[model samples]
Target: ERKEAERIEQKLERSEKEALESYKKDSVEISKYSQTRNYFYDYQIEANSREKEYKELRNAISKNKIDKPMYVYYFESPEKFAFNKVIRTENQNEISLEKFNEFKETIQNKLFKQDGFKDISLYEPGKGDEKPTPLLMHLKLPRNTGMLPYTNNVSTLIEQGYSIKIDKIVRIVIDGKHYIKAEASVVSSLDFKDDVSKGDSWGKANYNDWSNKLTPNELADVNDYMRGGYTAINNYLISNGPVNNPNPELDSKITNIENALKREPIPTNLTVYRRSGPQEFGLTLTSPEYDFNKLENIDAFKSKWEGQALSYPNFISTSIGSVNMSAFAKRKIVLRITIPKGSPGAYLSAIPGYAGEYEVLLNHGSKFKINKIDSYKDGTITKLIVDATLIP
Candidate 1:
């Protein structure tokens, strides 16, 4: 057995040498065969098995049946379908897929390769706004379906028809119909970027690696809080409409949230829970308000996350952990934080005229330490937990 094991090990080493050589030689050759496509079919598919869960989320949200609070989004601009129209047709623009079919058939191609699972085939990045045009169509479940779109491996071409064989629900905002953030994939023959050598930006290892997840129904609530907080900060600093700007309009909102934290002293060491997205925990973490309502929605299967900083930073929000906290955790990445006495946050709900929350707020840039991390896959979706402590 020892001799056989040694022999096998030697063969593995020899294969590695051959593979390295082959990779180097083909690295350049594959360059010659590179051309990508992105598909965005503008048709909505039925949510099939996901119908029941989707409806429940919709009902909960519409009926004001939330014990945990939520943020309802009001569309800021007029948005309408561009139907059979291709605007601008410039470097970066979109075209209608009136000439396409097989959206459901070809999209299911699985692009699954021998080396890894290419859950999708994205139109390689090219100059748009300057060169290539992304197809303007979508892959989505019917409107009013409470389910969230799949992540990574199961995403659309830009937008394509969606199928939920058995997946977790999470949130992402798309079009005007909002709730649970999810992207509609569209396929096009255009390149969406400048670097062709990088291969697809959405690489295989990129999708498989993950962290915490969300049930999506709670997405709008988080989005409003996140959007509201970031707005005052980004607007003032980003210098937009600077083409012709104003200050008092922005300064006041920022003033309110900041000043509110100073009104009261924050007690420490309170155990709390934060429902967040794909983030890699580190030495210091800053966030939005931490509270219970964040965990209220959980019937989703985002099938998302892993290690790394996130694509978009979350305006960190959490809830204090107790009997109620651990009861609702799934398709969500949760953080259990123990305060260390000198926390800079106060209960916004505690302010005079405010008692709508069990929320404990933390000042921006507040620091915390990740004690450990773990996850569980209950067959439907994956759930991850990050335990940490707020530093004094």
Candidate 2:
């Protein structure tokens, strides 16, 4: 019976080798995006599942023998699991035969080692090793007995999608010799989905347009808009450019524009597509208290410099008196601006009848220093409070 079992083992080993060779022949074109389907991959998985039966038969044969050390082999590495490496491609006809073969060879080489075989450990049982500690004792001193570390190591393996099995613990004793053996089976993580390349671009986006996590692109627009506001003061120096004129009024406007640009925009009382039907994009600029129509010079500057007109209705003033008067000559402008999701600056300029709102705030040749921008969100409204100081 022992001789017969050894003969059967040799036959099974040969069959396993042939199965591996057949898989290698066909596995030349496999990638994350493309995989090829062959029945041998499934066969490999089923064959591997029979490892327990073979180990049990061997253990039974070795149990009564006291003269020899028992030899046991196990599948311990998921990286070399054949079925886990199989790839099934969708558009095989579209793939060039040459390219496919190249990928297939690379993938097959990755799955199959040229030198090393599947990971396995060999153990020899010695005298007086036939008894293991009791199960209750095993539970009492778990970590001290090395089981906790073993369990944690296997838990990590499972979390990574590997299939694993703890076969049996072995102890063999003869005369004064003592030895113990452990066996296990492992398989690599399974990938059964058709699309194997998911979650490949996790951190590629540079911007995400909401108030928070503002992308680099949106931040650039904010910079350009503020710079354009400063550029407007340069225009005063050109036609009224700050080149030769020692005009304090002109100087005041320049200083105001400089201060405004120096401070960030005060964003508040913002709303999204709050009013039902197709809502405008980009940002919305508003001032509930200080009417644009009331400020004559500001209105003219908006019309002449910004090439657009803006008007506001009368509204209760809040925090207008709280304006920071820390600058040399601080003028206060209470404003509100709304930003929609993912809308570009160019899109904001195209809003009907309000193209100049964004422009006038920045290019009115006056300093509009932002004092504070308060944000509020309660599902019903998402707004920002903007307190800004204008120098003129």
Candidate 3:
């Protein structure tokens, strides 16, 4: 029976690979925007140079003014699952290609059933003897698309016109006895509205309305749009993650722009697109509060799950967990035990099976509130949903 199951899984793996080719969209030509890609290249290289450089790079990405919303969804899953059977197998931390595919399917179904019809875009990286927390492909969604569909692709939906680019780092348990860990991202750059600064010349034309009438080159437009979009989004994403918030420096800059507009009157037309809608601006999406406050502190519901802790040990799985975050009934974002220094819970490897309340720290930067908590892996596993607003 086991042998048959193994064989079935093998065939399934092959089928998934074959299916991807049929469904996958062609990648956007990154090179066309050499100037734009170079900006990222400089940032990435600088990120490796020193901690200070990394911080600057991150902040620069966050404060950038762009049209589209960017996201970096991080996930960590246990590659080593100890079953009731005493039989310990090596490479247990690895998620087989088949299982990896299954994970995607599971997330997809969960997201699809949610309120928003968000189809998240995901990127999968495969490595052996490594922790297999499935990661996502870099997805860039227009502001018009609600949270559900934008993230749903990460769950398991098909991509329409949007494009996906991915980079991955796999965490694997080196020794069979040690645990494996990995990080994957489905990152998207914020949308951009390139401004026309004075004195900038494009070919033989002067800076005037005539430039618009000139036979616009498809290559030039696409090139500018793509590169500009990436620069704008990357500028913000490089700085902010869920962990950091209340960025005063950035808030001040945005305020400064608003104030400058009120005083001297800088031309809004100076922006890349003269008539882009509010959705094109990247700032709105950062706050989940924009369209909906779908997530309520689950701390109120804590009493309800306490009774079942014995039956389901991981009850205290997270120090602070959120529920009803996504309008799509299924998808929710939960901040689990991500063991950095001073983190609430002990490292997953050290505890093995200590299922209890995890101390969660929430910050809009280094300073944060212990916003809330809920039971994960209790009688019923409740995960926080990230998609609150269905794209209108």
Candidate 4:
């Protein structure tokens, strides 16, 4: 199965020229607009230096032009929050404290594009692996801002006793009640895991990693291909015996297979479309929608299914392809599925079977709202686009 997966990887990376070029162009173009986000900046500084920093953000309450970025450390905390000079980001990249302060949150949440920082309660400062818990707090850091820090996990932070330290006082509103978030700083006396880089060295080697070799956009394709292909590989391995996961990084579920072979939310900016039909298999669809300027063998197979309106709303397994059936190979009937924002929790991306195709997956609990099924024709090919919504 592993060897088979390796071959599949080769196929996705090295394929036909024109189609691959289109896929690459679309991937690059689409990847540009929608940069994925998951973490926030946590600059290592002296623990909660209130006073002026508090005053700095305070004037912002008055909404004048001469205000520094809002800081949250001044908010009242039952216990003195402490930090042992550690980072919470995955990459642990460094940044200027002044620059980091630019993206702040308001009392109502969402300021400067960020949803706001981790809100850990002083009353119970979270413990264990529960993220955002006071003790295990990993306040978010924005992506493009300064040097982003890729951080360590709970197991690394827990044993070392990471104390909570209030950092930013996001805003004050509604009867003058102030809102705040965690902005952790160095708490000198703590231990860390070997894989987890400490202080100055965190995210230092981002360039050393192979991912930087490819443009961030191509990297997205690589990840999607690998992730999608692996789902099939994982199924094969599980059925044949033994176990395997993509990598032992990031977050998770309890079981090993369940953990590694997990479902990914569909990318909102990039549309996912597949051409095949299935059950107990993956959603396997395309990104940027497929276009069929040139015909392929799959066209003959799909022709029979034209005009066959889809009815089932349950989980489905389909191939990942492009937007236009003509661009990819059109038919009389179409089954277009575009996921709207906010309702994205169960889509997984994977590589396409052929050169031009890009794909993804979804779970059984999901649905096809059957929003629209408009039919149109171009040349001899008939096309229909349907909008499906993932149940919130």
Q: Whole-model Cα lDDT per candidate? A: 0.31, 0.26, 0.25, 0.28
Tell me the tens digit of each residue's lDDT in model 4 across 1-392. 23432332333322222222332334333221111110101121112222223222222212212123221212222112211112223233343344224322111121111111122222222223233211222233222111101111110000111222234533222222222244443222111211122311322221123343445544554455444544543454334322333433211211222222232323232223444322212222342123333343124323423222233322343323333333344232344444433333222222222242222334323454333233333444434433333344
Using TM-score, give the best candidate's number: 1
lDDT per residue for candidate 1 within 260-334, as digits (tens), equals: 444443433345555664323221223321111233221111112111112112123444322122234332455
Candidate 1 local distance difference test against the native: 0.31
lDDT of 3 by residue, 71-181 (tens): 423222221111111222443445455544443332321111011112232332334322223332234444433221111122332222121222332334343332222
Error of 4 at 301 (Å): 20
Q: Show where candidate 2 strays beyond 4 Å.
A: 1-229, 232-325, 342-392
Off by over 4 Å in 4: 1-270, 276-321, 324-331, 342-357
Q: What TM value does model 2 have?
A: 0.14
Summarize candidate 2's per-residue lDDT along 1-392 as a digit string, tens digits: 33433443343344443433332342222110011111112333234433333233223222322233323333221112222221223222132345334333322312111111121112222333322211100001111111000111111000111222334433333343222223333322222221212211110121122223334544444444444543544455545444555567646644443343334332322111111011111122343322233445333322332212222111111111111122301122224222222212221221233322112123233232232222222123332223222322
- Of 2 and 3, the candidate ahead on TM-score is 3
- Model 2 per-residue lDDT at 255: 46
**Per-prediction TM-score, please?**
0.29, 0.14, 0.19, 0.24
* Candidate 3 stretches greater than 4 Å from native: 1-98, 103-164, 167-173, 177-291, 296-392
